[PDB]
A = this chain, B = another copy of it.
Amino acid sequence: MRGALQLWQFLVALLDDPTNAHFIAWTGRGMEFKLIEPEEVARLWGIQKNRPAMNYDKLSRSLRYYYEKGIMQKVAGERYVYKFVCEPEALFSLAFPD
């Protein structure tokens, strides 16, 4: 994975592997996913990026950048639940993560 790997790509790599479901999982509702252990997801992102001071406060800023741009949505009334947006315009952003 490249130095400029997107958080969203890293999350999808984690989500694709059901052996990770103890800390992050597709919920089964469409493109919805849950961060079951948010600080563990952040720790793993820190390892990926060689940023040992990574934490969920930091990681969550990027989730918010994604949902403000309509690439993800934050699921209302839930904690730590997000979804990928299924839409022509969002797909362009995904197609060109660089």
Contacts and interface: CB of A to CB of B under 8 A. Distances in A.
A84 to B, nearest CB: 6
A21 to B, nearest CB: 12
B86 A12 contact: no
Interface residues of A, number: 20
Contacts of A94: 91, 94-95
Contact of A92 (B13, B87, B91): B13
Contact of A96 (B13, B26, B89, B95): B13
Interface of A: 8-9, 12-13, 15-16, 26, 30-31, 84, 86-89, 91-92, 94-97
Shortest Cβ-Cβ A-B pairs, 6 listed: A86-B86, A16-B92, A12-B95, A9-B95, A26-B88, A12-B92
